[PDB]
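Students often ask what a holo structure prediction actually looks like on paper. The answer is less mysterious than it sounds. You provide the chain, you provide the ligand, and the output is a string of discrete structure tokens encoding the 3D arrangement of the protein together with zinc ion.
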Amino acid sequence: ALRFITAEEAAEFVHHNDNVGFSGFTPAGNPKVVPAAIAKRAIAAHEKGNPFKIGMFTGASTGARLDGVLAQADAVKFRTPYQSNKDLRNLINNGSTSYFDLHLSTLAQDLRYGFYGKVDVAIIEVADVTEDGKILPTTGVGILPTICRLADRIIVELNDKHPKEIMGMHDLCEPLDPPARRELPVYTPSDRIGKPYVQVDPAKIVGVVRTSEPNDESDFAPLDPVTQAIGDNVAAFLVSEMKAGRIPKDFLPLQSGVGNVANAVLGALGDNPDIPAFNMYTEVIQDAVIALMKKGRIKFASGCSLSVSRSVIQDIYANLDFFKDKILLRPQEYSNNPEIVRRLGVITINTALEADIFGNINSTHVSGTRMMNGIGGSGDFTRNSYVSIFTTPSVMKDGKISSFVPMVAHHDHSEHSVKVIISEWGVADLRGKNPRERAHEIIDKCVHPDYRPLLRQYLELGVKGQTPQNLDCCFAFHQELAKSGDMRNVRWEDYM
Amino acid sequence: ALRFITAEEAAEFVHHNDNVGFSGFTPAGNPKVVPAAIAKRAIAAHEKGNPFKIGMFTGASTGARLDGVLAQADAVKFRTPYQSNKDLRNLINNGSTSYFDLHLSTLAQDLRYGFYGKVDVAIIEVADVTEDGKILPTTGVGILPTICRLADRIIVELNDKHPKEIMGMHDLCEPLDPPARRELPVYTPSDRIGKPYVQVDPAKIVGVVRTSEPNDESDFAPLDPVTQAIGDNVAAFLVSEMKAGRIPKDFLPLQSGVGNVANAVLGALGDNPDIPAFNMYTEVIQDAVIALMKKGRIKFASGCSLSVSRSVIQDIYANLDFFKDKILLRPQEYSNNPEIVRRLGVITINTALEADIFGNINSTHVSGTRMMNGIGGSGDFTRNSYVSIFTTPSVMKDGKISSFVPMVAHHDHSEHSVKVIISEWGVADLRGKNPRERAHEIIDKCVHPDYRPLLRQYLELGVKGQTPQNLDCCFAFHQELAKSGDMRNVRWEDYM
Ligand SMILES: [Zn+2]
Ligand SMILES: [Zn+2]
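The corresponding structure tokens follow.
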């Protein structure tokens, strides 16, 4: 039978060098009390002279009570595929651990393929665990089905705050693997192809820890004119494309990242009457989506996690009557699947840390060296979307930093994949343009006035060829930031 | 009824500013006499003071009697999505025309989406054209079905050398477009999902030009120890992976580029008994594949074109009894489809112009500025393959040029997509490794001895962060080639 234990007893099932997979996608759906117990245990081993580090496989980001505590404990032998915690991020950038970010849709199958070793244990947060081994996830799916299948033992965390009435909001499954794989039967963003729970051998459950962990509440989200501008441009562009005949009149499924811009984009879409009621086929469903949903603005939402504030999650749970049939959570293997994304003609909208005049995007490394979060699913989406869009305020640091540079210090998306770029200044449709033509378009429409003439001068430095990159000074902007702290101080005659 | 005309009369149906789509993939399946007649016509307009340039949509590369003649005629207003002709290449690199290379699998649908204007006329090479508008392609498919559907008028070229007995070797079709698209029903590389011909309204055929154009013959293909080495490493790695459990015992579908390395790889596979009889799910089927096919080494071949020498094509046509059911040609929309590639677990092997120590690949720009051919289908494949492999001799120009550099002068494939790199020196499995770990692996296994210590010194230049790129000298190798002509002359203390 199912054995109930403490977070301390559960932590004993994790040993040094073990590879652990965690449930959830973003803090949502992730274990919150056991990982901290592992950390104590890990630290107690360190100061005793004994080594203690585990390999970590997750869906995406985890709370501060996962990566944070584990990172502060210096017990991370390796991490994948996406993170978003300051402690772990520093540990990484200080070269104190091994981190490799992957396209989110690929981790599950690659685990099955045996590309990354063994999964020793799986720690999961649940809304309900049956005696016959049926698991009901909470608010995030990630790689749940795969870690439960591959793990030697499973440590369950039964959260008080998530009701079993949620049953039906998840669509869990895995496909056969080559050479036996069939198609993934989703032709609409609301199609169900799996089960509302994951089935495992109850014998693998080494224990069930009871918890009662509420969602955090929404923390300070001020409005910003630059993002208001960006969000409007996105919405206006899209309606404009439909009437131009480049997007079907009934619109298409959408995908957006998380953040202020995303929020502004969603708000703009909802307020533009020319944008028909739409569905989401995203990664994470945020408050902004729920808000539009209550106004009938968004008809349905497909995602990998429901990452909403406490006020919003309580409203949903109090109204399963309304939300149950409008929200569907899938493993990232499906929510970010190239096959599904391309078939449905999902329109993707993602952010850029920086972009260059030839349409290349950097979404992970600051100055090309410091890791940020991870490529995430921006590649899975951008690459296969009907039309890929990248948004970003034109400048930063009171204008001393330009979001647009001659060449990105780190390439995450290439000229062959980025179709449209949008800032507060306007939109640059890159389709059908060569390098020089898209540079002028990006310069005139997206770049901040303070940097437009300088980037125009970059295109006239005498370089011959398809792409006018000047290897002697393509990184002058980044170099100048390090020297003066203000990229506007660049003068090409100084960098050559 | 079908009207038979000359290449000169046919050329009259093409006007300045018209967008023309051509059939075929690589010279194979492309028109050979009409485009030259357009060129004459174009030149006659130029010297008369009148403008004359057409937009060009093709599958991939075309003969010298297509891009070459058209480029020499300076009648190219814009070109897509891949080219491989010296005249056109120079025209491009001299900034005399607009060229934009795309992921091959995306051109067909994006044309239907309306992303690139209108298709005025389609010039196609045929083995048979029925009176009721049934077209039978020759040796290359490309974007045939799409250009025939979208074009206002069609100019057919009936080639004597290709028999209608070929009927059955093509699988032609197009899928519905979002939001109505269904799955692409190919679960095996030999699955048929379309028709052996393309149906059009005979009224659109403005004329049929009779031709008799034979395949070129195989031209000088000497053996090279470096490629022999590379090919063996690829084959040995693969058998090694199967026994390690990272590739199913019965193997998987393969995809390789064209060239000496590719030929060596195919040969190595055929000669390694631990490599089971396999199938191809490539872009272009070359002589090397046919050779292995006759030895039962390759069981079947799926591709977009059969680009073989005259000796080989005659052997096939004289033995449809053997080849007919073993070769299947598809539109690049299907032969390079992400959905199919990932579902079948296609193992992809492509070349690299250059690669950097962090796993990024450049497959198009020399020194980051001079266009080569185009990204081609390397992205469609690499990105979605079971395991992506990149091959390349370690050096060039008698060792004065290193194929491995600190940072690639042009990014076509990122660290998140490149899984394995192989040179004559060994193989570097990049999976599960962070930037520093994969740099040391690439340095120790793939890099030529003459450059290993220098790239090791690059990793110790004091740079902090996830990725040790030094923006002050990451391009020193390229810069030194331009200064001395020998990258070995680099000394980091000189570039900083
Ligand atoms: Zn990256
Ligand atoms: Zn490129």
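Residues A 364, 375, 412; B 414-416 surround zinc ion (ligand 1) (CB under 6 Å).
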